[PDB]
Design a protein around this ligand. Structure first.
Ligand SMILES: *C(O)c1ccccc1N
Ligand SMILES: [Ag+]
Ligand SMILES: [Ca+2]
Ligand SMILES: [Ca+2]
Ligand SMILES: [Cl-]
Ligand SMILES: [Cl-]
Ligand SMILES: [Cl-]
Lengths: 14, 303
């Protein structure tokens, strides 16, 4: 639905 | 980039540095991709001719055994250890392992696991006793640069990575050609089955494989496609390389500023039905102190 995610970032969980 | 280290850089000879590396001669290649299904936000295009100065590149991603020797010699503490957690794929978290409630938006298969780090890749209770020759994982971009500098090396640029990974083929889809499993043989460690629910392990592995698994490419590099994502030196952008200039076409270094660093090559989790990012032109990024169970690196060096 949005661009697939392969690189999970520490910033993304905040 | 100007890193800070708490260990001295040891003296090493050219012969020592070059062990396990292949010499890529200076020359040109066609970088990028124009697959019509590429995600526009990834900036795989345009295809362009890039000239590179000669360089050395590791045949293998850096292994657990090698990273352990670096840590033993320096006392280096990885970003995941400082933070106290790293990202583990959900299917690899042992039941009962303490986990954070953290959510990676759009990617619920990633679990933030306290105590997951390079030596305990699934969290407390796991180890690398049976994975000495697997790629080191849970290493951030900072950790990779620290290792590479200690080793007398550096990270490859995205262009260096891609020239080496293409292995002398002009605009092929994969390091070895255009078919994913030529002659019915698996050539890389990616996902088979139904992502993210069930990995059939048809290629032999439902996690990382040894760094020397599968046939190499035409230049002698192993697992440039699949296995683990590999950090490169460049800051990420989708469009810096769309400009036609010496800076973007001769030894290109990427944009001078950014928020995330480039990662190349795909991993054991990639699949055509979701990311399709195990093609050699594919690219993504991650922020430089981030770490995960499917991300490692290989080094490059100036001859
Ligand atoms: C959404 O656009 C989406 C979701 C999963 C896999 C691919 C894509 N494009
Ligand atoms: Ag992927
Ligand atoms: Ca696999
Ligand atoms: Ca790879
Ligand atoms: Cl997109
Ligand atoms: Cl091993
Ligand atoms: Cl082929």
């Amino acid at each position: 639905a949005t661009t697939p995610l392969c690189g999970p970032s520490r910033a993304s969980i905040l | 980039h100007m890193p800070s280290f708490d260990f001295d850089i040891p003296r090493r000879s050219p012969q020592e540095i070059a062990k396990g590396m292949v010499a890529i001669p200076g020359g040109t290649f066609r970088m990028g991709g124009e697959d019509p299904d590429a995600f526009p936000e990834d900036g795989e295009g345009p295809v362009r001719t890039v000239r590179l100065s000669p360089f050395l590149i590791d045949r293998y991603a850096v292994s657990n055994r090698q990273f352990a020797a670096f840590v033993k010699a320096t006392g280096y503490v990885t970003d995941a250890e400082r933070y106290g957690w790293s990202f583990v794929f959900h299917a690899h978290v042992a039941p009962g392992t303490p986990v954070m409630d953290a959510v990676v938006p759009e990617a619920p298969w990633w679990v933030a696991v306290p105590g997951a780090y390079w030596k305990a890749p699934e969290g407390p209770g796991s180890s690398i006793t049976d994975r000495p020759n697997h790629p080191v994982v849970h290493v951030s971009w900072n950790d990779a640069v620290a290792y590479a500098t200690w080793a007398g090396k550096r990270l490859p640029t995205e262009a260096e990575w891609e020239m080496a990974a293409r292995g002398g083929l002009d605009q092929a889809r994969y390091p070895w050609g255009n078919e994913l499993t030529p002659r019915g043989r698996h050539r890389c460690n990616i996902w088979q089955g139904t992502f993210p629910v069930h990995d059939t392990g048809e290629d032999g592995y439902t996690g990382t494989a040894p760094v020397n698994a599968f046939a190499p490419n035409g230049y002698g590099l192993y697992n440039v496609a699949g296995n683990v994502w590999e950090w490169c030196a460049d800051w990420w952008s989708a469009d810096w390389h769309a400009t036609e200039s010496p800076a973007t076409r001769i030894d290109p270094r990427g944009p001078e500023t950014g928020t995330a660093r480039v990662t190349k090559g795909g991993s054991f989790l990639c699949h055509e039905s979701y990311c399709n990012r195990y093609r050699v032109a594919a690219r993504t990024c991650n922020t430089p102190d981030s770490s995960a169970a499917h991300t490692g690196f290989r080094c490059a060096a100036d001859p």
